[PDB]
């Protein structure tokens, strides 16, 4: 029945990808004195169905100067990635308990840059070429802060096994030991994230990033007998983070590129190095090095 478990994950995540959009528009709506989708079905419950089947009935126009092969495989990778990093999440018990789950999460999430890079190239337009160039450099700039934060975070965890994160936190949320890193981590997650697909690809990244941040910094207690306790806690924590993720979507003017690079390489990277230096010696400092096994 293991295959059934995959569909018991991919589809609801796909629906979860579908259904937080109404949350977004109504949160973004009610924020600006507005109402959000509330006329199509009760409180816009059927609004996601109101757009999806319309989109699939819309003809997918293709640019004349577009390489079809790349134009159709770039979304293939984009969706394939966006629904793959959901598999090793230590949600109650992960589908895959890869001993190197954190590395697998990073390598495969850093692969998303290919989709946007190919989309700009395959589209073959002046707008698409720069937009791909801007998006990728913004993205490829920000794994170095991503990797260091996660690396330095995991010194006090014990290994890259994502299931071990629960044991590490247990007593207190792990933010209380690395809250300078949490703001370091959370901000970096904002910027790293056919056309019908591209909704799904980046969007699962939005929730999973917050799901990834949820387990990493704000853990829960996984009772061996009853697993529903971790389920509710995990969902509630990743909902609060995502609401915050859209809380800041309509609360700041968007970053400009020169500051976007300046913010990292001159005010985020050097501080990330110091915290990593702080969190590499502190387990040694207090003889609190964790067990890998």
């Amino acid at each position: 029945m293991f295959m059934i478990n995959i569909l018991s994950l991919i589809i609801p995540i796909l629906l979860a990808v579908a259904f937080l959009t109404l949350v977004e528009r109504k949160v973004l709506g009610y924020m600006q004195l507005r109402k959000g989708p509330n006329v199509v079905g009760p409180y816009g419950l059927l609004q996601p169905i109101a757009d999806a089947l319309k989109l699939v009935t819309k003809e997918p126009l293709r640019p004349g100067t577009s390489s079809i092969s790349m134009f159709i495989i770039a979304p293939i990778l984009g969706l394939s990635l966006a629904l793959t990093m959901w598999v090793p999440l230590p949600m109650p018990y992960p589908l895959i308990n890869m001993n190197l789950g954190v590395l697998f999460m990073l390598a495969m999430s850093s692969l998303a840059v290919y989709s946007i890079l190919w989309s700009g190239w395959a589209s073959n337009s002046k707008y698409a070429l720069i937009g791909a160039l801007r998006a990728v450099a913004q993205t490829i700039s920000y794994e170095v802060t991503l990797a260091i934060i996660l690396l330095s975070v995991l010194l006090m965890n014990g290994s890259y096994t994502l299931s071990t994160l629960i044991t590490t936190q247990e007593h207190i949320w792990m933010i209380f030991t690395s809250w300078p890193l949490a703001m370091m981590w959370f901000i970096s997650t904002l910027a790293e994230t056919p056309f019908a697909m591209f909704f799904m690809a980046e969007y699962a990244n939005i929730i999973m990033m917050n799901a990834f941040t949820a387990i990493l910094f704000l853990g829960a207690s996984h009772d061996p007998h009853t697993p529903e306790l971790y389920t509710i806690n995990f969902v509630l924590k990743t909902l609060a983070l995502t609401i915050t993720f859209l809380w800041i979507r309509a609360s700041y003017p968007r970053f400009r590129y020169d500051q976007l690079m300046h913010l990292l390489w001159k005010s985020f990277l050097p501080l990330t190095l110091a915290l990593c230096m702080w969190h590499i010696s502190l387990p040694i400092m207090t003889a609190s090095i964790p067990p890998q096994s």
Partner: protein
């Protein structure tokens, strides 16, 4: 057996969705190199969580610190000599 099975079904649903979708109806290169050089430095300091459980931990602390000091020096140099500042 299990791993590629999960990968296979993941792309397959990605395949069926897109298939029905299109059948039913100097500065930029500069930092990109610096990121490359930085990223390779990242891989060097990745095995640290296991390295924290060695018996020669005294020589680990100096060595592991040495990378971060030296990696920061590359950033510090790159910053000072124009460079890392967004070129035009």
């Amino acid at each position: 057996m299990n791993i590629m099975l999960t990968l296979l079904t993941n792309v397959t649903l990605a395949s069926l969705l897109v298939l029905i979708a299109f059948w039913l109806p100097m500065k930029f290169f500069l930092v990109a190199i610096t990121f490359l050089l930085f990223d390779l430095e990242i891989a060097l300091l990745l095995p640290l969580p296991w390295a924290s459980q060695t018996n020669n931990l005294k020589t680990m602390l100096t060595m592991a610190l040495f990378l971060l000091i030296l990696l920061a020096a590359s950033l510090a140099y790159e910053w000072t000599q124009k460079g890392l500042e967004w070129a035009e």
